[PDB]
C-alpha cells in the first residue's frame, strides 16, 4: 500500500462509538460478567477447565460507510474507558467479610485491561501456561499443543475474529504482525492487587504511527477488540469468579486515498 | 449551537463553594458515615438500606442572569481538593487496635474520588454488581433491570438532578452522553488500600475541550458533582462504615456568544 | 494592591529555616514522638490528650526592613519566587534496635510506618485554615487550639470553623487543613497517605526547586516585611516492644528565595 | 571514527523472538526452572542447574556490507509474548484460602532486555561468594568475600545460552559502549507481575552524539532475562516462570574509518 | 566567579566503583551487616559497630591544573554529568541458601524491607547534619556520630556538623546530608521504609543525570579531588532462625567533567 493524501471537507470523517461486553463464561442466568467459580486442577495432566470458567476476548466487526487507487477510512482518535466501575463498591451481595463483622472483600487480584483498534482482526500468537490443559469444546485454542508452547510455537497464529470464542489465558496479540491495529495491554497478576479504574470524557489516544497513518479499514470494516477482566470476586464461601466490565469506544475515521 | 466569539473586559464570574458529602448518615451524630455494612447470603437477597448507600453529590448553582444570537457562561478553569484530608488521623476513637496496645486502624479501604464541572445535569449509566439487588424507597437506581444490568443495559440512563438520592455504586458517568461535562474519576478497590490524598492550591485544571469550548452553561446554572468515599472506618467491633469528605470547587467562567 | 516591577540590582534575599516537628513530646526524652495512642471505649468519650496530637508547625521570619523612609503610593514588599525544601533525618528511621517491636521472631524491630502527613506552605501572611473533625464529639484538650461549638455538620463542613495558623505546638494537624477559600496569599502542599502498613517513601535532593509564583507571575507578598513557613511532617508510628505506638516526626527544612517588588 | 549516515537500499530490519532458559527440569516444563529448594548454610549453598535461570542471547547476521560501511542500530520494539498465560490460576496451584482459587506467579521478577554490535559484557557479582555453580554453566572463577560486592576477575561475554545464570552477572556497567540495555529487578515475595504490551512504543538506541551500536562483522547481538515471578504449586513448592521476548530492530547503513 | 569553559584535554572522565559498608560482620561476610538485635529498654540501645550500615566515600584524584603561577584566574575541573547505577541486582535472586522459607515448601525470603539508596557528587566531601532517633542510643568505638547528644539531637541539633571525610565510620542512622550546606555537591537520595518493602532497582547504561545548578554551573572540584559518596542499603536479608542482616551492594559512578576558567 503506497498511502498518499487524507481528503477534507465535510464529508471526509465518520465516528464510530459503542460498547463491547465482556465475555467472562456466564455459567448462569443470573451471572452475566462473571466466571463460573475457579476449580484447580491436581496435576497440570489433569488441567481441564470447563468453558464457563475461561474469560474470552470481545470483539465487533463495525462496518464503516462504503467507499468504493481507492479511499480507505483510516483511524485516527480513540477515547474510551472501562463503564460502570463503581459496580466494584457492592460489597454487600454475598461477599466473604474481610474480618468477623466486617464488609465483604472487594474484588481485587488478577487484571487484564486490554483494547484494540485495527482495519482487520487482531493477530493472535497463542501461549499456554501448561501445554497440556484441555480447552474444552466451544473454545478456540493452540491446537497441537507441544512443550515449546509454554514459552514459543509459531504454529499457534489465528485472527480474533468470534466474540466468546478465544481464551484470554491462551492468547496474546502477536507482535510479529498487527502491522494494521494498534493495541494496548496491561497484566497486573497477584490475589490481592486493588484494582486501580479511571474515568473521564477528556482523554484521547492518537492512533497514528510514526509516519502519520492510522489503521486502514480494509473492505470498510474497523475491527475493536477488548479484554476486561477487573479481578476476582470472594463470595462467602471463599470461591472465586472473574467479574468483568464493558468497555465504550469512539473512533474518529478520515478517508484517505491510497494505491495498492 | 454556534460557538462564536469571547466577550472581553464584565465579561468574567467565579464560582466557589464545597460539596458536602452523602455517604448515607444514619443517625444525628453520623454525617459523613454510611450504617455499618451488612452482607447479604445470597445474591438474590442483597437489600441495602439506604442510609447504607453512598450517593453522588450535585449543587446546580445559578449564575448572573444573561440576555435579560445569546451569551452564555463558559467554565474555562477547575481547582478542587478535597476538604478535611487530616481528619483522618484520628486513630483514637473506639476504633479496631490493630494489634494488642496499638492504634486503632486508620480509614482505608475501597475508595471513589470522582468531580465533574458541566453546563447542565451529569449524564448517567447504570451498571449493577449483581441485577437482583433490592435498592431501597428513596434512592433512585436502574429500573426494570435484567441480568445484561450487570454489563450494560442501555435502558438505564438518568440525569444527576437530586442529591442524595442516585447511589454511586449502580451508575457511572455515561460516555456516549456528557458533551457539555468534563468528568473525572478513580476507583480504587480492596479492604486494605491506603488513602493517599494530595492537597494544593497551586494546581488548575482546564476545561475547554479539544476546540478550545469549556462547559456551556444552560439557563445560566453551573452543574457541580463529586463523590469522595475516602474508605472505610472499623469500629472496636470490627463493623465498617463508609468515610466521606467534602470537596471544594473554584470555577473561573467567560461569557461566549453563540447562536 | 496593583502589582507593579520587580526591582533589580541588593534586591534579593535569602531566608534558610528547620521547622522542628510538634508531635507531642509526652516527657523530657520524647522530642518528636507523641504520647502512645489511647483507644476511647466509646466513640461519643473520644478525649485525646494533649501530649498525643501532633500539631502543625510555624515559623514568622523577619525579612531586611523595607520602606524605611516615607513613600508616597508605593511600598516595596518581599516577594518569595522560589523554595527548596526536604525532610531532615530521613536515615534516622533505619534505627530498628531501639526497643521496638521484633517482625517476627529473632528478627530486626518494625520501621516507623503507617500514616502520614507531609506538608509545607510558604506565605506572606499565616496561613489560613478550615477546621474539620473526624468526630464532632471529641473533647479536645486544654492547651490546644481547636473547632468551637462543633455540632455534627463539623464531620463535613462547618464554616464557623476559620482559624489562622499563628501559633506553634497549638493547632493540631487532625482538626485543620488548609481553608481552600482563603490563602490567596500562601502556597501550599500537602500529602495524607493513610493505613498502619503504610512504608515511608521520602526523598532528598539539593537540586529540586519549587516556583511560588501563581499564572500572574506572582509570588506570596510578605506583609510588615515577614515570611510565614509552616509544616507537617508525621512519618508514621514507632511500635514499642508492648505494641503501644507513638507517632515519629521529623524537621523541615526550608530555601526561600525573596526579591522585593513594588506595589500600588 | 563515525562518518555519514548512507541514506536511499540504506537500512534494514531484524524481527525475532528469545525463548526463556529457566531451567527447564523435564520434557514437559519448558518455561519453568525446577522446584525452589534452601541449603542450610551458604557454605552448602550448591544449586541445580535445572533450578538456575540463565541468560538468553541471539547473534543476528546482517547483509553482508563490505574506510567500511557498518550496520547501526536506531529503534527497538519489544515487548513480553504470552503475558496472559499467568492468568491460568486452575493448573495444579496452591489455593489462596479455602476454596479459592491458585495463587498467581508473583514474586521476584527480572526482565532485562540489550542491543548491541557486540556480546554483552558481564560483571560477576554472587549473593554468595561460597555457592558451587553447578557443571554446565559458567560463573564467577576464583570467587573470594569480596566477589559479595565486587570482584574486578569476574568479566565475561555473554556469548552462549543455557549458560549463565542470571543471578551470578549483570551487565557491566564498566563497559558495553556498543551496547544499550535496560533492566528492572523487582524483589520481595508477594509482588505482582506488571507487565504491558503495546505494538506503538518505540526505544531509540542512540547515544547523546547520536550514534547506535554499530555491528561488528555485520552481526546484531539480543540478550534477554524475563523471569516473571514463582509458580506456587499445590505443596507449596515454587518455581521460577519465564516467558518469550520480542524484538524488531531497525538498523542504518553508517560510514566508519 | 566562574567566567568560561575551556575547550580543545579540556574534558575527562572518572569511572570508579563505591563498595558498600553494612558491618562485614566476619570473613565470610562482605556487604551484609551483623545480625539486628534488640535492646531491652528504649534508654538501652547499644547498636554494636558490625550492625551498623555506614556510608560510602571516595576521593579520586583529578588531571593536576595550575601548574604554572596564574593571576587572578585558575582552572578547576567541573563536573557535569553522572552515570550511576547498583551493580549486582540480580544477587538478590539467590532465595536458595541460608534462609527462612516463605511459606510450607516455598523458597527463601528474599532481601527486602527498609532501603536506603543514596549518591552524590562534589568538589568538596559532602556536608553532614547529624539527627538521631533517639538521643540515649550508645553509639559504638571506631564510628564517628553525633557528640553531645540532648534531646533536641532527635529533631534538629545544629551542633552536629560534619564532612563524610573517611569510609566505614559515619552510620547511615546517624548522619544526612546538610540542605543547609553542600552548595558544591549534588545528592540524592531515597528512604523506602517498612519491613516487607519490596526492592525496585533498575539498571541501564543509557541515562544520565546532569549536575549543573541553574546558573549552568557543576561542581567544581578544590585541589583537582573529586568527591563520590554512597549507600545502597538494599533491605535485609532473614536467615533460616529469622534473624535480619543489612544487604548492600555497590555502586558505579562515571563523572564527564571540563575545564573552567575562575576567578
Ligand atoms: C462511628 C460509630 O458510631 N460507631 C459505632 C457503630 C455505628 O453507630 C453503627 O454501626 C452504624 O450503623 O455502632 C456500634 O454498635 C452500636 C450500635 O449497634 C448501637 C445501636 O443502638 O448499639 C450499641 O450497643 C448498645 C446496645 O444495643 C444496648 O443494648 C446497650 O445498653 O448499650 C449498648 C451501647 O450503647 C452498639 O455499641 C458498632 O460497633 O457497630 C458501636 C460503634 O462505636
Ligand atoms: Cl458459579
Ligand atoms: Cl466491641
Ligand atoms: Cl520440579
Ligand atoms: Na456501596
Ligand atoms: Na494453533
Ligand atoms: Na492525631
Ligand atoms: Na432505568
Ligand atoms: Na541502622
Ligand atoms: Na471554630
Ligand atoms: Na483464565
Ligand atoms: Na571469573
Ligand atoms: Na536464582
Ligand atoms: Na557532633
Given at each position: 500500500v503506497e498511502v498518499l493524501e487524507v481528503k477534507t471537507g465535510v464529508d471526509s470523517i465518520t465516528e464510530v462509538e459503542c460498547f463491547l461486553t465482556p465475555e467472562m463464561g456466564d455459567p448462569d442466568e443470573h451471572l452475566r460478567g462473571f466466571s463460573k467459580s475457579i476449580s484447580i486442577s491436581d496435576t497440570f495432566e489433569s488441567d481441564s477447565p470447563n468453558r464457563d470458567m475461561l474469560p474470552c476476548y470481545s470483539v465487533a466487526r463495525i462496518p464503516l460507510p462504503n467507499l468504493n487507487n481507492i479511499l480507505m477510512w483510516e483511524a485516527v482518535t480513540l477515547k474510551t474507558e472501562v463503564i460502570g466501575v463503581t459496580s466494584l463498591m457492592n460489597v454487600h451481595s454475598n461477599?466473604?467479610?474481610?474480618?468477623?463483622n466486617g464488609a465483604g472483600k472487594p474484588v481485587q487480584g488478577t487484571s487484564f485491561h486490554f483494547f484494540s483498534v485495527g482495519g482487520e482482526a487482531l493477530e493472535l500468537q497463542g501461549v499456554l501456561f501448561n501445554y497440556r490443559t484441555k480447552y474444552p469444546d466451544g473454545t478456540i485454542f493452540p491446537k497441537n499443543a507441544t512443550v515449546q508452547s509454554q514459552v514459543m510455537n509459531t504454529e499457534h497464529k489465528?485472527?480474533?475474529?468470534?466474540?466468546?470464542?478465544?481464551?484470554?489465558?491462551?492468547?496474546?496479540?502477536?507482535?510479529?504482525?498487527?502491522?494494521?491495529?494498534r493495541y494496548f495491554g496491561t497484566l497486573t497478576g497477584g490475589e490481592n492487587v486493588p484494582p486501580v479504574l479511571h474515568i473521564t470524557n477528556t482523554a484521547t489516544t492518537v492512533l497514528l504511527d510514526e509516519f502519520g497513518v492510522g489503521p486502514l479499514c480494509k473492505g470498510d470494516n474497523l475491527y475493536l477488540s477488548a479484554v476486561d477482566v477487573c479481578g476476582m470476586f470472594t463470595n462467602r464461601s471463599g470461591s472465586q469468579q472473574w467479574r468483568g466490565l464493558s468497555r465504550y469506544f469512539k473512533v474518529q475515521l478520515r478517508k484517505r486515498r491510497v494505491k495498492n
Open positions: 461477599g466473604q467479610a474481610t474480618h468477623d489465528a485472527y480474533l475474529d468470534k466474540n466468546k470464542a478465544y481464551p484470554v489465558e491462551c492468547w496474546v496479540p502477536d507482535p510479529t504482525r498487527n502491522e494494521n491495529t
